[PDB]
Amino acid sequence: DDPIYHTSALAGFLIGAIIGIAIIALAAFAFFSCGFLAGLILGFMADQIA
Amino acid sequence: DRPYRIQEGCFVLPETFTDRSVNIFILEGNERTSPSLNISRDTLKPDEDLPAYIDRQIALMKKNLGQHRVLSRAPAQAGTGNDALMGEQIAATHKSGKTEVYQRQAGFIATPGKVLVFTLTSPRPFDDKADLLWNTWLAGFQPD
Amino acid sequence: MDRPYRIQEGCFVLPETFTDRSVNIFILEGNERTSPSLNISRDTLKPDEDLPAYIDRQIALMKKNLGQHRVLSRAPAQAGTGNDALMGEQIAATHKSGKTEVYQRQAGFIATPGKVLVFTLTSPRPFDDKADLLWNTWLAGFQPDK
């Protein structure tokens, strides 16, 4: 059930759309898109639509 | 044993892996005020062709994003000449609080069952520069 | 101007002013339980920052942004084999996600001057022999672009 380890809807157009808005609107995304924290990027993305 | 290529080199993976990589390109230091590019992947459901997949993606974005609006949908092409990929593109808007973004997204079947998606995002309505970037980006793609 | 950029599916041209923040994500299939996943990310070294200092900064970022981040080990790491192999550093570390303890290995390497390449394995349960072999098989098979 966890998108970090399983296929999910966080793919394709949906993740592409979320990534774009996050870059502009969420300062924290700069940290979750590089370095060690990026290992959990899909967990961060899931939280943006929950 | 399966090879995989990234910009920095190549390696091998387990045979049954699913690629959910997201390529992300930003103008650093102006990330909130400049266009960004990203590339994502997806897998078609059984008996699901690309038009039905995009139908499904549009509904997912309306359900999960803020005031998602699809303004247009039209054919798209990734690459040029014999090796080009056919697909569809949309132009859309959605919001996160009082911030509105503008996006163009195009999806293509790269290999059987596998979708490749290109997304351009801007914090402002697309000007001529942003339209040029969109078209040069897609036209320059060379499938392996 | 526009420079080439390579992905699994092909290549394209990218204006040289764009910084690459791609995150590769590889979802593996489980057996009786959920399987670890693999991830590759990028970063930029600060001026006069060496790799150990960069790793320190990353550990601090994980501590600030996650729950109960705990380093279990830190040691040298190697990406690839032969003359072109990259020498770097790795950690093993856990953190809490809801009610569950997540296990990670993360290794950083200076791939090109000023540029860090990070390899990550994430598991919802303690490492086992299978997960350890995956980690070392993956790192050993990396072939840097020459």
- Distance in angstroms (rounded) separating the CA atoms of residues A2 and B48: 24
Strand partners, C95: C102
Q: Tell me the two tokens of residue C67.
A: 């729950």
Phi first, then psi: give them for residue C141, nearest 5 degrees: -85, -5
Write phi, then psi, for C66 (nearest 5 degrees).
Answer: -120, 170
Strand order in the sheet with C67-79: B18-19, C24-27, C37-44, C115-123, C100-112, C86-97, C67-79
Q: Which residue of C has its CA nearest to A8?
A: C27
| Amino acid making up residue C11 | C
Distance, in angstroms, between B67 CA and closest chain C CA? 27
Min Cα distance A5 → chain C (Å) is: 5
Tell how strand C100-112 and strand C24-27 pair up.
unpaired
Sheet holding C143-144: strands in order across? Answer: B2-6, B9-13, C143-144
Name the resolution in angstroms: 1.9
Q: Touching check for A37 and chain C: CB below 8 Å?
A: yes
Residue type, A36: F
Q: Which two tokens stand for residue C114?
A: 């000023």
Q: How many helices (H) and strands (E) does chain B have?
A: 2, 10
In this structure, whether the domain defined by C2-141 belongs to CATH 3.40.1000.10 is answered with yes
Over its C-alpha atoms, chain C yields an Rg (Å, rounded) of 16
Tell if the CB–CB gap between B101 and A16 is shorter than 8 Å.
no
Q: What percentage of chain B's residues is helix, strand, coil (to nearest 5)?
A: 20, 50, 30
Q: How far is CA B46 from CA B49, B141, C5, C88, in A?
A: 9, 27, 32, 43
Chain A residues whose beta carbon lies within 8 Å of the beta carbon of residue C39: 38-39, 41
Q: Which two tokens stand for residue B60?
A: 């997912």
Strands (E), C21-123: 24-27, 37-44, 67-79, 86-97, 100-112, 115-123
Closest listed residue to residue B91, CA positions, set B108, B68, B73: B73
- Helix/strand/coil for A33: coil
DSSP 3-state of C46:
coil
For residue B21, give Cα distances in angstroms to A9, B26, B39.
Answer: 14, 16, 8
- B40 chain-A contacts, CB cut-off 8 A: 11-13, 15-16, 19
- What's the distance, CA B137 to chain centroid? 11
Architecture category of domain B2-140 in CATH: 3-Layer(aba) Sandwich (3.40)
Q: What angle do CA A27, A30, A33 make, to 5 degrees?
A: 140
Closest CB from C27, C104, C116 relative to A39: C104
Q: Are B114 and B45 in contact (CB under 8 A)?
A: no
